[PDB]
Design a protein around this ligand. Sequence first.
Ligand SMILES: [Cl-]
Ligand SMILES: [Cl-]
Ligand SMILES: [Mg+2]
Ligand SMILES: [Mg+2]
Ligand SMILES: [Mg+2]
Ligand SMILES: [Mg+2]
Lengths: 116, 116, 117, 116
Amino acid sequence: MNGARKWFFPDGYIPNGKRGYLVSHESLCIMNTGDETAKIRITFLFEDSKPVVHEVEISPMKSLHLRLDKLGIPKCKPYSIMAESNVPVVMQLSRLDVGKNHYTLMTTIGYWEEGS
Amino acid sequence: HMNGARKWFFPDGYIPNGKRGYLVSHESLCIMNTGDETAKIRITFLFEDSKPVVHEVEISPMKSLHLRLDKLGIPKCKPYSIMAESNVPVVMQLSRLDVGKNHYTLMTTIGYWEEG
Amino acid sequence: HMNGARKWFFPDGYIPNGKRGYLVSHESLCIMNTGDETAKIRITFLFEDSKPVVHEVEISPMKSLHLRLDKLGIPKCKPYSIMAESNVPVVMQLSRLDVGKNHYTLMTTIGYWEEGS
Amino acid sequence: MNGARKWFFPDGYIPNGKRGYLVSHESLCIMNTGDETAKIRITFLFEDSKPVVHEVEISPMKSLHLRLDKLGIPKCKPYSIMAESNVPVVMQLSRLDVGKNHYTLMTTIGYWEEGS
Ligand SMILES: [Cl-]
Ligand SMILES: [Cl-]
Ligand SMILES: [Mg+2]
Ligand SMILES: [Mg+2]
Ligand SMILES: [Mg+2]
Ligand SMILES: [Mg+2]
């Protein structure tokens, strides 16, 4: 099976703090253990705005740590993620919240469905 | 057709009382609804030696909702657990921000799900 | 229809030894019972080079229980894993607070479940 | 049998910071509640490099907190993990990111498949 075709992450938020050259961010980590390249449609849902959809690809037997703070998503704006792939993959979302006086990480494997 | 589950569970609930400037410790129950109908969600809070308390919230179609649990009248520094039941499938994640004059940390997890 | 699963697993267990003020480093095995019957839970601790240690707890209907694992006689700073078995479906989450004079951090995860997906 | 034969962790990364005896690392925690020793093949996937595979064993009714920073994996290089066992097991991945001025933990149970 090598994963699932749909992944969901309800708690999305790009903090705006930084420390030196290290900036707060979220990384949507995706892995493809299959033999086919994965085309993934990433839908971002907001609290009072319409959805925004991005697209990425990940080659066979490769990892991809996608920096969500580089997609034009407004910083400090709550959102949720729905990712749909044409082939099974596995995803995990991690957040780094840093500032002059703080530095913390949090992570979770996502909720999955479709060819689990 | 639809994505998610109707029931979500989060055993580790706790609202810290620490404050850091204008920032206050809290927990955010993040919910996403990828469906076409508004989700009506009943959130039940279970305690260790007190009876349950139930709240209600709604999330519009294709929207995200980061619910601040520290704004519901739940006693601070009181362990609890959460059972959330929706009329339509949704996805949930619970995150906690514990902050104080000398600390700042985050933790999160996708919840356990049922019926979806 | 009951909610939860009868078996829960948490591979990363560890009780840190630091403290700060009123707080001490610890792990909290949080369990919830949304059913109509009391849950009798057998908690097994597995170690890397030692034999298992088993504890027992009970949780009444529609109640929460945040079990402090640092108060069970488990050696501090000794890696372990947890297998929990309940007579009725429940839901569990494990969280760790690692604190000291110069650090304070939390981590958590819903556990892996079996028999009641 | 308790557990699953395949486990996946998309967000792998070994930080390079240290603080005294403390060294940043990731611990792949595995538990075997079965009666037979588990032979586990751990595959590491990278963003622009080929996979690297390691092997470990875990005795019956034992825990194993595997230090991933002791396997020759380049530090500060994103990767993902796929672990395959001949018998059912359960896995969790935790990261300690520590330095002169920070100390933080994050963790998640992994995505699983081929499990009872
Ligand atoms: Cl975490
Ligand atoms: Cl998690
Ligand atoms: Mg922290
Ligand atoms: Mg954390
Ligand atoms: Mg910290
Ligand atoms: Mg987590």
